[PDB]
Amino acid sequence: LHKEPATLIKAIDGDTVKLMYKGQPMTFRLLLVDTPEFNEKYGPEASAFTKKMVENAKKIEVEFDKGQRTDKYGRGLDYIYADGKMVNEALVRQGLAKVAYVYKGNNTHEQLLRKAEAQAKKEKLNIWS
Ligand SMILES: Cc1cn([C@H]2C[C@H](OP(=O)(O)O)[C@@H](COP(=O)(O)O)O2)c(=O)[nH]c1=O
Numbered sequence: 861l862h863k864e865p866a867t868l869i870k871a872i873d874g875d876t877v878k879l880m881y882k883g884q885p886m887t888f889r890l891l892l893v894d895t896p897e898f899n900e901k902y903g904p905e906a907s908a909f910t911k912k913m914v915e916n917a918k919k920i921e922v923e924f925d926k927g928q929r930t931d932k933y934g935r936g937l938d939y940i941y942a943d944g945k946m947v948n949e950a951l952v953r954q955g956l957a958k959v960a961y962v963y964k965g966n967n968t969h970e971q972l973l974r975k976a977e978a979q980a981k982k983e984k985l986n987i988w989s
């Protein structure tokens with residue numbers, strides 16, 4: 861897979877962010893994870909976590925996987941990096957997202973994320989508390 865440039869437009873919630881990509885505004889949904897909705901328990905903490913990560917980043921990158929690049933809503937499906945750190949993984953590692961929505965063909969980082977989830981759960985962090 862390949863990292864490509866993007867710039868933040870605005871944090872939306874734990875697992876959706878608006879970025880400019882190839883010069884066009886696009887809403888991106890993070891591959892392989894599910895954060896709680898803002899209305900749910902840990903939703904506000906997930907939103908805040910993503911928001912801090914993407915806002916503080918000097919460099920945002922997006923990475924498509926091998927499959928569908930957009931979902932049925934027209935959201936981009938990607939891994940997003942903030943100064944080289946994957947948001948999708950970081951959310952999981954901190955118990956603020958579950959590994960989820962694993963579709964065959966767009967699952968390159970599956971086992972990386974599952975490993976993070978196991979550690980978050982060991983530590984009983986947040987969602988796993
Ligand atoms: C993460 C992801 C979500 N989706 C779709 C499935 C879900 O459809 P439904 O809307 O019919 O439930 C929805 C979940 O996203 P959200 O968790 O943002 O709601 O997005 C994909 O199609 N591909 C993906 O890789």
Ligand SMILES: [Ca+2]
Pocket residue numbers: 875894895896897
């Ligand atoms: Ca969600």
